[PDB]
Amino acid sequence: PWSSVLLGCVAATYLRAAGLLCWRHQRLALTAAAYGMVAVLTQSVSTVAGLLLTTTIVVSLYGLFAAVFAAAGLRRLAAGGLLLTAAASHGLFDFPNPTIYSLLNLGFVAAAVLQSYFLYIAPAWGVNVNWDTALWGPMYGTAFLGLVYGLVALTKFDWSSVVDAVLRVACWFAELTMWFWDTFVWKFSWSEKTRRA
Amino acid sequence: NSLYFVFTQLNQKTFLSYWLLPVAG
């Protein structure tokens, strides 16, 4: 779509918009109101999914602050949708009954797939991405984090599986190191202290 | 928790850790 690949990303953010008395829902509603005002005017950390969400918030905040604060208007619309992405990730930051955020998660992952289609096939379809770094970067970044969210969320994952994988890799390298030592450097029957003297 | 932030001796099992000192010196 050339310069309307940005309109495709805008449609992705509109899909992100598709997805009570506590302060968190008030914060989400305030962020959505800020998205509405910006769009009409410009024209916790202890889980891996939380890491991706925080990252998304940070990146997309820098994105809005690098494009909107700093078919030409699609370059501002696709960056205005980054605040909707940040609102969705701050909603999922407390993922609070999970059934409230389940549909938000489904819309988030579906439009992350749509952005990871549009922006990924954008260079091969004619348009160029390398031109504007501070504009073009954060949408690719949030699409990446969105996809790895649909991988770290869909399968439970958590820090437990990360620690288990790190321990398995270190354990296999440990047995390789012990075999290498006992076979080439010094036999463990020579290195250790023979008891029963 | 109930232990101190101190090392453990490596010469309780092998003397091989003593090979690093002259080689590095």
């Binding site: 390298f173 440990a174 190191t177 | 001796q9 490596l10 010469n11 850790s17 690093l20 590095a24």
Partner: protein, 51 residues
């Protein structure tokens, strides 16, 4: 002998620190870790996993 007896009753901690702790559990692990990291190449296996 009286002064040695008095000083041996006074100290009772520094003697264990200097006879048990100071080399084997304070200085020698530091020396072998620093020596290994100074010796082995800048490799993930040799710098982390093998030590």
């Amino acid at each position: 002998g009286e002064r040695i007896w008095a000083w041996r009753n006074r100290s009772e901690n520094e003697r264990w620190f200097w006879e048990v702790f100071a080399w084997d559990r304070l200085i020698f692990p530091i020396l072998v870790i620093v020596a290994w990291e100074y010796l082995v190449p800048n490799h993930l296996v040799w710098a982390v996993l093998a030590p």
